[PDB]
Ligand binder design. Sequence first.
Ligand code: HEM
Ligand SMILES: [Xe]
Ligand SMILES: [Xe]
Length: 183
Amino acid sequence: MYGLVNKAIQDMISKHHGEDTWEAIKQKAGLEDIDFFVGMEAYSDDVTYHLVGAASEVLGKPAEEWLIAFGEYWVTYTSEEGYGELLASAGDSLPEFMENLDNLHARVGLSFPQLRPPAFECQHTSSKSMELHYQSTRCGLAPMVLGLLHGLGKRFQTKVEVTQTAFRETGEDHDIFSIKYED
Ligand code: HEM
Ligand SMILES: [Xe]
Ligand SMILES: [Xe]
C-alpha cells in the first residue's frame, strides 16, 4: 500500500504507546532499515501486514482488534494530515459518505496512480439502515472497515451498529455488513 498508510500506523502506535514501542514493533516487523515511510510512494502490501502482525504480538492484542482501532484512527489521521477538505467533500452523514466513497477514492487515485482502492456499494434498507458491500483485492481488512465505520460514526455524531454478515475469507464472494444508524 502507499506509504501514507504505513505512516498512519507508525503515528498511531507512537501516539498511543510511545516511540520505544513503535521501534520494537518496527524491528519485529523486519523493517529496522527503513528510516521513514514515504507517503506518496508505493510499498509492498507485505510491509503493512507485517506491521499488523508485529503490533499484535508486541501489544498483546488480537490483530483484528488492533485493526479496528487503526481503521477508526484513519478517519482522524486523513482529516488532519492533508485530506480534510477531501473528506468534508464526501458528505455530511454516514449514508451519504458511504455512497460517495468510491468517488472519494477515484479522486485519491488521480494523485496516487497505483492505487488499488476498495469498492463500497450501499443497499439501503431504510432511511436508518443499509447493507454494505465491501469488495477488495486484499485479504484480512474487514476489521479495519469496522473501525472505519465507527470513526465515521464519531465524525458525524451518529450511533452506528454494525454486524458482518458475509466473509471474504470463508470463500464467500465478498464481505457484507448490516448497519443501523441514528442521531
Ligand atoms: C474515511 C473513510 C474511508 C474509508 C472507510 C476508507 C476505506 C479504505 C479501505 C478499507 C482501504 C483498504 C484497501 C483495500 O481494501 O484493498 C483503503 C485504502 C486506502 N485509502 Fe481509503 N478510506 C477512507 C478514506 C480515505 C481518505 C480520506 C484517503 C485520502 C488519502 C484514503 C486513501 C487511501 C489510500 C492511499 C489507501 C491504500 C490503497 C493502496 O495503496 O492501494 N482513504 N481505504
Ligand atoms: Xe486505510
Ligand atoms: Xe492496515
